[PDB]
Amino acid sequence: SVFSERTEESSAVQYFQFYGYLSQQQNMMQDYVRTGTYQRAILQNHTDFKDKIVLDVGCGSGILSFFAAQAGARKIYAVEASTMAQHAEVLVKSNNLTDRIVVIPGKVEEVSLPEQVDIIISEPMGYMLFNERMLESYLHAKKYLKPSGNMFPTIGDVHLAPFTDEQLYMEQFTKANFWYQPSFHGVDLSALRGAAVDEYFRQPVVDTFDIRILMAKSVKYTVNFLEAKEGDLHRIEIPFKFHMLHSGLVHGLAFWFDVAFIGSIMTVWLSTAPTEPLTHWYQVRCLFQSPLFAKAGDTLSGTCLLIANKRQSYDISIVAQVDQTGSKSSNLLDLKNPFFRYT
Amino acid sequence: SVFSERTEESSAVQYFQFYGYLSQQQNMMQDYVRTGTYQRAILQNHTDFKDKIVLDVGCGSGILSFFAAQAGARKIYAVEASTMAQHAEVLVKSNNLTDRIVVIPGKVEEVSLPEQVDIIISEPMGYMLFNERMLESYLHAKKYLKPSGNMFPTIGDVHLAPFTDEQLYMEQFTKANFWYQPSFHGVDLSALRGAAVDEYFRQPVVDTFDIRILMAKSVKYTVNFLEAKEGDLHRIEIPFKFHMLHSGLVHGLAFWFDVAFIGSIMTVWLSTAPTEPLTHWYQVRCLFQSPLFAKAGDTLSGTCLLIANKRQSYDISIVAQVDQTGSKSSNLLDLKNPFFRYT
Amino acid sequence: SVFSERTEESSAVQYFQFYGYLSQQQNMMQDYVRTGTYQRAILQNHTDFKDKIVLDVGCGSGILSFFAAQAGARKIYAVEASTMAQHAEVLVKSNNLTDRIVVIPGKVEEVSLPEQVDIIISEPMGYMLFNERMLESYLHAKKYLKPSGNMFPTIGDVHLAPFTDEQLYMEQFTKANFWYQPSFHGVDLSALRGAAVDEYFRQPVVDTFDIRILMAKSVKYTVNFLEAKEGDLHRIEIPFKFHMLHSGLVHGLAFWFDVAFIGSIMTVWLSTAPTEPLTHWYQVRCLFQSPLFAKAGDTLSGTCLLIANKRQSYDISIVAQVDQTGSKSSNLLDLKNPFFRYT
Amino acid sequence: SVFSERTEESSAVQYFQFYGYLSQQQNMMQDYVRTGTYQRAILQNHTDFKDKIVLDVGCGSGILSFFAAQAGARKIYAVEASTMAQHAEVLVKSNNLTDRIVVIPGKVEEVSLPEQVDIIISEPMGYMLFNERMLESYLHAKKYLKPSGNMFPTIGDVHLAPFTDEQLYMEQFTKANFWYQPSFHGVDLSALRGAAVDEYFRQPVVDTFDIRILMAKSVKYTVNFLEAKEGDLHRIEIPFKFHMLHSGLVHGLAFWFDVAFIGSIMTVWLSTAPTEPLTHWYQVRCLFQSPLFAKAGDTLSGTCLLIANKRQSYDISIVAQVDQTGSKSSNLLDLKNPFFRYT
Ligand SMILES: Nc1ncnc2c1ncn2[C@@H]1O[C@H](CN(CCCn2cc(C[C@H](N)C(=O)O)nn2)CC[C@H](N)C(=O)O)[C@@H](O)[C@H]1O
Ligand SMILES: Nc1ncnc2c1ncn2[C@@H]1O[C@H](CN(CCCn2cc(C[C@H](N)C(=O)O)nn2)CC[C@H](N)C(=O)O)[C@@H](O)[C@H]1O
Ligand SMILES: Nc1ncnc2c1ncn2[C@@H]1O[C@H](CN(CCCn2cc(C[C@H](N)C(=O)O)nn2)CC[C@H](N)C(=O)O)[C@@H](O)[C@H]1O
Numbered sequence A, B, C, D: 001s002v003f004s005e006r007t008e009e010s011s012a013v014q015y016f017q018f019y020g021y022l023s024q025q026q027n028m029m030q031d032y033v034r035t036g037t038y039q040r041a042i043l044q045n046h047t048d049f050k051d052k053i054v055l056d057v058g059c060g061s062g063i064l065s066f067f068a069a070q071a072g073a074r075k076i077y078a079v080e081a082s083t084m085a086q087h088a089e090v091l092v093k094s095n096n097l098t099d100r101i102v103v104i105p106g107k108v109e110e111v112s113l114p115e116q117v118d119i120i121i122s123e124p125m126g127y128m129l130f131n132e133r134m135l136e137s138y139l140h141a142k143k144y145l146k147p148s149g150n151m152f153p154t155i156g157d158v159h160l161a162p163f164t165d166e167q168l169y170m171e172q173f174t175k176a177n178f179w180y181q182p183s184f185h186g187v188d189l190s191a192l193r194g195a196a197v198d199e200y201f202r203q204p205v206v207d208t209f210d211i212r213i214l215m216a217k218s219v220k221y222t223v224n225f226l227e228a229k230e231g232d233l234h235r236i237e238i239p240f241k242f243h244m245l246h247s248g249l250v251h252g253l254a255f256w257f258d259v260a261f262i263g264s265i266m267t268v269w270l271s272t273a274p275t276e277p278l279t280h281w282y283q284v285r286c287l288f289q290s291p292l293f294a295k296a297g298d299t300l301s302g303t304c305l306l307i308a309n310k311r312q313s314y315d316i317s318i319v320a321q322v323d324q325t326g327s328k329s330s331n332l333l334d335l336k337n338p339f340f341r342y343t
């Protein structure tokens, strides 16, 4: 299948085992911004669902399928590959919706649906939008979508902006400096110091922050889920040119995302921006191994390149340069294994 | 190999990727109780190492092999299956010990050693001793041990004791009762409340506690690494008969372990008991599905049965009854997915 | 002469030029602890001066000679090598003490005195006591001292103790990390980071601190000025063994000193300890390039080796070890060019 | 050599020892105005460097030579007399530019260069431009310059302006009045008050100030480095006639400087004016011994005579008079020993 061809079995087992836990579903369901905004997007656009055929990609517990039912959908095919599919069935029965919600266990790339659908609903967004590579499963499912069909969410915006945060930088650098010791219990570790710094700075930092640490207006990269093909997400190149609003040390790039549900009645936005109420997606920051100094008015240019790997994530290459001075920084980050810092 | 036969590839990949991180090695290296006691055990028993041939099973960074070198070992074969073997090799060279420490990348069940060894050193202990099933790799390595060879550690003691902790018990229902609501965004979730409760009770609880919650002297189960066979750890039956020192409700069993390095000069103990300074092993508690009431002087008898699975862990079956009343409780726990509760 | 043979002229020029400024004399005179304690020491032991012959080694403005006059000294030879000798003479005249204070311009190692003296007074103490190597001029002057003659100060105690101050450490490490940049205006500086670290940590830090940063009782090294010869100060070896009172990171050794004026009437102490009111000597700290971890009860052993150089200062070699673990640290410091951090 | 003949050795020793420190090179490098402007001047005039032969006088870390390399220089001679030459060589190697940059240890007046150059680059400016007398080394190097060759910087402007600062003036007496007391610990210090005052007034004051203390537009004295001879800087006579913009008491003259890089594409200016962002050169103020009252519209005329001395500095002689009133004041200052006042 398309899924297995792009996915290490080891990664898939772990991935679907994770979403098989009810405690994990609870955590997502209790993100009221997420759950409430999804419900608002669906119900406020009930005409896009009323008497329509629906596909829910990765239905989990089934909550989005239930929203579609509340909106009057004639039939909802709810696809889920983890064992959570069993629990969704339980809820469909106990909520007397067996006549409209049909759970189909399996990967959306592998199952067979009885008919084409009018609209696909899903929550395929991971950290920094692209983590988990579930967007590709979402786009893949368009093979079941009618020509006049819609997608909820319809588009995704990735925002990136330069930030200054000495404390975060020193916090990570301090960890790596363990490997700087010349005599840990009499053992010289210093030879691995380079490898250590490399390893720690490879971790994106997931948490939230004050918007005042941002040093320039964000750059936006848009994915149109109605137009995009699976293959478009294998290599994502995001060029940027920031016009620095403040002077100081740039310690890296901050990331967040918005998705829009573009319905017939209204467009509803779900935002994970630091200016908005916090979600379980928080925000993501990629540190430079060495900060770049820039003055207000300078331009910070470069590229954020995401290369999809078989562990359902991306290898992230960030190259940034202060155009006026030629000060350049590079880093490779592994989006699969971020550092969860929020407390 | 023996390893691959008892381990699902998926689990093995995840397992050795985990130990491939310098940060994970670091976390263990910074557990001073663990690292310091090993160093003391080896150095204070220098006659067990002086001019001897040593095998280090799962050398990680190589730290224990360096301790063996500090103790005067002639040659140390340091075996490591994760990519950490590369970093260990770097350290052996940078510490000018290539003539005495030989890093051998691969699983100890699969590599070939050039000669027999006088002593095996290792740190194969997981949560409640047996988690990760690395003890079987440690025992397996005895095929390279001379008839008079020693093992560091030499023995392992697992202790179990009944505890009362009303707050821990109730906490499970507080979390599960999330699902006991008739209209979460219009959805009746109550049907899954039972499954949620079950899921929470299947998790052993990793954290520490006040020793005053213990209701009886611990029962001890000893593994003699000099005598035990790999197969002995596939099914571990720990019968118990506790003599209650206090009256109250028993909410489950608490676990911890000790290992002893029985050397020619002295015996050194490494303990993770709740009476001792905390380690990264903390302690482990398994709840009963229903608490058992016992008064001081009563006996709580039953069995803790540990069944090895291919996910490098154990299925835990606990059955207990208050003999004087016949009140009975049981639980089935999955040691692979513990709940890390420590704050 | 003894002075010129041990001193590079360039250093001597700068040295005596420095003390030729009235603003510098003012700065020392306004150290009230210093000035008040000296007057205290001399006047309360007036019997050690009454009708006695006195030598003031490096009289500067002449302040100590005036104290000796106030205490009833019959004749004071005030030796001063800088141009300050001219100003001291002005003060002697304006204070009508020409019959009692005799200024003798020149280095104490070179001038000729008409007679032997009963007591020598001086203020030869520098940073960490020994800086400036004036103690050797003070000891050299005993060639003019009568048998059984006295010296003010009579003895000097150097104290050293291990300290923890993560903030100071990172402050110095941050500065050196400038040379960590791989693209400073497009230039890779990283090749010089080792040299930068070596240079910055070579600087003793002159400032004060809260006594709570000290991790063990101080070790004391005593110089008896009545007994010592100048040659004793060419190589000063200070062994130490600290019994750690607290667990934590040892970032270096803190230094301070006391001198005692052991007179016939009473003993007066001048202390620059952090437990005492601040003087212009403050305290001195020598950082390790990498801190050593120790738990309470451990012993920190090693040697502080001071080698006098021809620049009127010392090359400082510190080697320290946590005995229980073998964790070892070394540093080379240049006492001549300290980092002034206070306020 | 020319250098040794004009420099007392002790001063030279101290001078080049000072610049042998990475921390001092760093301080200059971290002055973004200085470093950024040099880079801009060189790169924006790339036609003046492309395939050219370059001489860098006093290359220090080598930073300006790398800029020349960025601009396309065919070959760069980097001359440095301090031990910093070793570190520059390291950077040349680590930046793979050994084929283009040649580090030459030694004084530019003493080394031998194999060929003539197209352009000389350097940063020889000190306090009030002329301090350190490195400009003479810069001009001396033109013996290696082709007739059609250029100089970067091309010209240097020293600016002078009268200022009022009652607090600064009074400050000198407040400090000197320490000595005006009849019993400092029993000593009459009054006799040295005059000498103390004189001492303070001989020190030019290095710091910055509010431009509002300036009472007239500056007078400019220009040195054209393309035209000037080394000997021109031995005696610098700067006549001035200020047209007073404000009425009040003039307490002295303020100094600052500009340099211009006159390239084929554009002229780039580096300014240390008090109207511009602060640099490590700050500004310099020389007091009159007695203030002069002047009215708006009056003219303050006189001479600032700079006389080079053997300590790589200048004796500053200032004479000024209010023409309309005939009120006259003078001062003689020692630029070698300035008072660093900046807070
Ligand atoms: N190819 C496929 N075929 C069928 N089913 C598939 C599939 N790929 C994934 N799934 C399934 O999709 C579900 C996605 N999950 C939403 C996950 C989005 N997300 C990311 C994060 C943060 C971070 N990335 C993380 O890993 O936690 N939090 N939520 C739950 C959303 C669902 N709508 C719900 O409400 O419960 C999961 O249950 C998963 O098993
Ligand atoms: N069959 C095999 N062949 C070769 N190498 C093998 C192997 N099986 C395991 N290993 C390797 O053994 C190492 C064990 N690890 C110690 C890990 C033990 N541990 C348990 C826990 C408790 C809990 N379960 C947890 O996960 O933290 N924490 N650490 C490091 C020990 C190291 N010598 C040290 O003392 O620093 C790991 O690096 C692992 O890759
Ligand atoms: N061989 C010699 N022959 C003749 N005269 C000599 C001499 N060596 C030094 N001197 C002279 O001795 C004076 C020492 N100075 C006190 C110096 C002690 N000190 C150290 C520091 C801190 C630091 N080490 C520093 O100042 O660099 N501050 N004061 C002043 C002491 C005098 N009692 C006074 O009160 O004014 C200076 O005036 C110096 O010129």
Ligand SMILES: Nc1ncnc2c1ncn2[C@@H]1O[C@H](CN(CCCn2cc(C[C@H](N)C(=O)O)nn2)CC[C@H](N)C(=O)O)[C@@H](O)[C@H]1O
Pocket (backbone or CB within 6 Å): D003, D016, D019, D028, D029, D057, D058, D059, D060, D061, D062, D063, D064, D079, D080, D081, D082, D084, D106, D107, D108, D109, D122, D123, D124, D125, D126, D127, D131, D132, D134, D137, D280, D281
């Ligand atoms: N005759 C000679 N032959 C060979 N080399 C020589 C020389 N004379 C001086 N030098 C050397 O010239 C260098 C000048 N220095 C710039 C220093 C000038 N400066 C003055 C001030 C102001 C004030 N006077 C102060 O020093 O505080 N700040 N920097 C570094 C400039 C460097 N290229 C840079 O721009 O990064 C120094 O390293 C010095 O050793």
